[PDB]
Amino acid sequence: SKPFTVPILTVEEMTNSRFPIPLEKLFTGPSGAFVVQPQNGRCTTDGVLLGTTQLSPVNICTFRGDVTHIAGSRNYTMNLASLNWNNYDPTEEIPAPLGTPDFVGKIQGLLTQTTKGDGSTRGHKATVYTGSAPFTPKLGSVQFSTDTENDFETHQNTKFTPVGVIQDGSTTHRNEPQQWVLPSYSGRNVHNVHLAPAVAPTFPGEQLLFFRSTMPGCSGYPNMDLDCLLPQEWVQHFYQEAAPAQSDVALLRFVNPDTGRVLFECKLHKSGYVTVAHTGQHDLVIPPNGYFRFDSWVNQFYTLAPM
Amino acid sequence: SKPFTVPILTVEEMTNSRFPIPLEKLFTGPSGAFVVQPQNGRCTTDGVLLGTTQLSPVNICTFRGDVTHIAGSRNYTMNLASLNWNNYDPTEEIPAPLGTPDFVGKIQGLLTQTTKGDGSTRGHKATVYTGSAPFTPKLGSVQFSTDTENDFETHQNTKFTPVGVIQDGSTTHRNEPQQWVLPSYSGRNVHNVHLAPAVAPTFPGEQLLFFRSTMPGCSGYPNMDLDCLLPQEWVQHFYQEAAPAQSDVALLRFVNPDTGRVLFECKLHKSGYVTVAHTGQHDLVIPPNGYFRFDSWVNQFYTLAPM
Numbered sequence: 001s002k003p004f005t006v007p008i009l010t011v012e013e014m015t016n017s018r019f020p021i022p023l024e025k026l027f028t029g030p031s032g033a034f035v036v037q038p039q040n041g042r043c044t045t046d047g048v049l050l051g052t053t054q055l056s057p058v059n060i061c062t063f064r065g066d067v068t069h070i071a072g073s074r075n076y077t078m079n080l081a082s083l084n085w086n087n088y089d090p091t092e093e094i095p096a097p098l099g100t101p102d103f104v105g106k107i108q109g110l111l112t113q114t115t116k117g118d119g120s121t122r123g124h125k126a127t128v129y130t131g132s133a134p135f136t137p138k139l140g141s142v143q144f145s146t147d148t149e150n151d152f153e154t155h156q157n158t159k160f161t162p163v164g165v166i167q168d169g170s171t172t173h174r175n176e177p178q179q180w181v182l183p184s185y186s187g188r189n190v191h192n193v194h195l196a197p198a199v200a201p202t203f204p205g206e207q208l209l210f211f212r213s214t215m216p217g218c219s220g221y222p223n224m225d226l227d228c229l230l231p232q233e234w235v236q237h238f239y240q241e242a243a244p245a246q247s248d249v250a251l252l253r254f255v256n257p258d259t260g261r262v263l264f265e266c267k268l269h270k271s272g273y274v275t276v277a278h279t280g281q282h283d284l285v286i287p288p289n290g291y292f293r294f295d296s297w298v299n300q301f302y303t304l305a306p307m
Numbered sequence: 308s309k310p311f312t313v314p315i316l317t318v319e320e321m322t323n324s325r326f327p328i329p330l331e332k333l334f335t336g337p338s339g340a341f342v343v344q345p346q347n348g349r350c351t352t353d354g355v356l357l358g359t360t361q362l363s364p365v366n367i368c369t370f371r372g373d374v375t376h377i378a379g380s381r382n383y384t385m386n387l388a389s390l391n392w393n394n395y396d397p398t399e400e401i402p403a404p405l406g407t408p409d410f411v412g413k414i415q416g417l418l419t420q421t422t423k424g425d426g427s428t429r430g431h432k433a434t435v436y437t438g439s440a441p442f443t444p445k446l447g448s449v450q451f452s453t454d455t456e457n458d459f460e461t462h463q464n465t466k467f468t469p470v471g472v473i474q475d476g477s478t479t480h481r482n483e484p485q486q487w488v489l490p491s492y493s494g495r496n497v498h499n500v501h502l503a504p505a506v507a508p509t510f511p512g513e514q515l516l517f518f519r520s521t522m523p524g525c526s527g528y529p530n531m532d533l534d535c536l537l538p539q540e541w542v543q544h545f546y547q548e549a550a551p552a553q554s555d556v557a558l559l560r561f562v563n564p565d566t567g568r569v570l571f572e573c574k575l576h577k578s579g580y581v582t583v584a585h586t587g588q589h590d591l592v593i594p595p596n597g598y599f600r601f602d603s604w605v606n607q608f609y610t611l612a613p614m
């Protein structure tokens with residue numbers, strides 16, 4: 001079998017696979033109070049994309065299409081198009097368009113538009129509430145709240161570029177976004193389909209290891225923590241390499257090339273997530289040049305040295 | 308020598324190295340009316356980053372620091388920090404902080420901020436004019452025009468996330484941005500330093516081959532074309548692989564795995580740019596699964612089959 005590898009990029013050189021921001025740190029914690037089932041940043045070690053995962057680090061939480069104004073408001077409905085501006089196909093066997101947000105929250109950014117005829121352009125602050133009834137990306141429609149009642153034109157290509165998240169400051173602080181709560185991609189009382197599975201540690205004394213970023217906050221008191229299971233660069237790497245998994249777990253060592261010593265070891269499960277031997281919440285302290293290295297194929301219940 | 312390779316990702320699976328948006332197409336044209344000296348997306352084939360190039364696809368045209376309000380306006384001065392929020396060091400031998408915009412234009416996005424004490428947040432539309440006298444990123448300072456006169460706090464971490472570009476619609480359409488005009492990183496009448504060199508075809512009948520995207524337009528009639536010399540994924544790949552160049556030019560073939568036939572060939576110069584045998588402006592038509600493949604090391608003046 002073709003030898004398996006992970007990139008040698010450091011954590012801070014890599015990108016969150018769930019929102020277009022750099023990775024900041026590694027974090028581990030118990031995950032019993034939630035279901036860890038993100039749909040972006042999902043890929044097997046042999047390169048099979050899962051859920052709503054696609055390859056672009058900058059086509060995550062974006063939308064494209066044309067918009068229609070909702071009378072008596074600053075709200076616009078976007079009829080979704082594909083990345084190359086073609087009609088959206090709701091019958092593809094995916095949960096929602098690839099790159100669709102995979103958490104319930106209020107994502108703020110800019111809605112921009114070009115008029116084809118003369119190249120005139122416009123841009124307005126906009127928010128999408130992924131927990132709202134009109135959030136139906138699998139059906140081909142989402143709604144944005146904006147700062148205009150009349151500037152956007154119909155039947156002109158329109159893009160949403162995400163920036164960060166908001167919260168209602170008159171309610172309990174940090175109560176949203178909820179990063180581990182999937183939206184209902186087809187709206188209220190319709191089940192999600194074609195999902196990447198939930199993940200959890202399976203061996204005693206282990207926890208998931210998360211690749212963590214802090215989303216920009218744009219209003220209120222949001223929970224800005226965002227954990228992904230794989231860096232976007234790992235998704236791109238496995239997709240290209242397509243090296244076969246020789247067991248259920250790739251043992252990785254995290255090495256400091258400065259001192260030449262292994263800092264810790266972890267399990268990269270072939271379905272695309274990482275666990276470590278630790279109990280409790282912990283922000284890992286790592287050197288800037290630290291990187292992960294594949295060392296060997298082991299079994300699911302291999303006993304790791306404590307992190 | 309370690310074998311040289313380029314990624315097998317397709318054009319549409321890759322990212323512009325000069326602005327955080329996907330690649331759309333390949334473009335070639337004559338470049339005599341301009342100096343092609345971009346500072347982002349610059350890397351040798353053996354993995355040496357040049358100019359202001361860094362590794363993150365989502366740390367391009369971003370800024371971070373703290374802000375001070377300019378009385379009697381909606382303008383804020385940002386005192387720049389590093390990616391990990393440390394003091395900026397102007398003595399590093401680079402043209403400007405890595406990821407600094409490398410063109411003269413008006414870049415619009417959102418300026419966001421978190422108050423450390425309570426986690427309160429705020430976000431406002433903001434524009435940076437990279438041709439303006441206060442655009443002095445190499446000195447550690449840039450100015451933003453915003454939509455607020457009082458909401459941003461002092462001595463709190465503040466981020467700018469870029470979205471697109473604007474133009475003054477009362478002046479000649481598409482006269483800005485000017486993608487091939489470098490800002491003056493230390494301001495008026497101070498020479499830029501430590502630049503990646505300008506590039507140009509050197510063999511008769513050749514033109515640069517550009518990796519092209521369309522920036523979102525946020526107001527007016529901007530020129531939204533943006534050409535990079537290398538995809539960001541190629542920068543990341545060469546940085547990791549560090550395969551030695553065995554001649555001045557890596558001959559690449561662009562292959563359609565569908566039909567099994569080579570579509571065209573091109574030269575990847577070891578200093579990190581591509582040329583093709585063509586005269587005239589041309590949007591290349593390529594199949595979605597088309598990709599580049601390294602075939603052999605050749606000399607600078609190797610004669611390519613016409614594109």
Ligand SMILES: CC(=O)N[C@H]1[C@@H](O[C@H]2[C@@H](O)[C@@H](CO)O[C@H](O)[C@@H]2O[C@@H]2O[C@@H](C)[C@@H](O)[C@@H](O)[C@@H]2O)O[C@H](CO)[C@H](O)[C@@H]1O
Nearest residue numbers: 167168169170218219220221422427428429430455458459
């Ligand atoms: C759209 C607008 O006019 N924004 C103002 C407004 O912003 C408020 C407002 O949107 C309320 C709505 O419930 O939500 C927040 O209170 C928001 O303020 C934002 O969040 C608070 C916690 C602070 O961090 C604040 O600085 C931030 O802007 O009023 C505020 C001033 O209170 C600003 O004037 C916005 O521009």
Ligand SMILES: CC(=O)N[C@H]1[C@@H](O[C@H]2[C@@H](O)[C@@H](CO)O[C@H](O)[C@@H]2O[C@@H]2O[C@@H](C)[C@@H](O)[C@@H](O)[C@@H]2O)O[C@H](CO)[C@H](O)[C@@H]1O
Nearest residue numbers: 115120121122123148151152474475476477525526527528
């Ligand atoms: C900030 C604001 O109030 N924006 C309005 C305004 O926007 C104008 C204005 O900013 C002028 C300043 O010289 O620049 C443009 O004209 C801009 O309009 C934008 O560009 C034109 C070419 C159109 O594409 C327009 O749709 C776009 O918004 O007025 C416009 C209406 O003319 C909107 O009301 C903005 O919200």
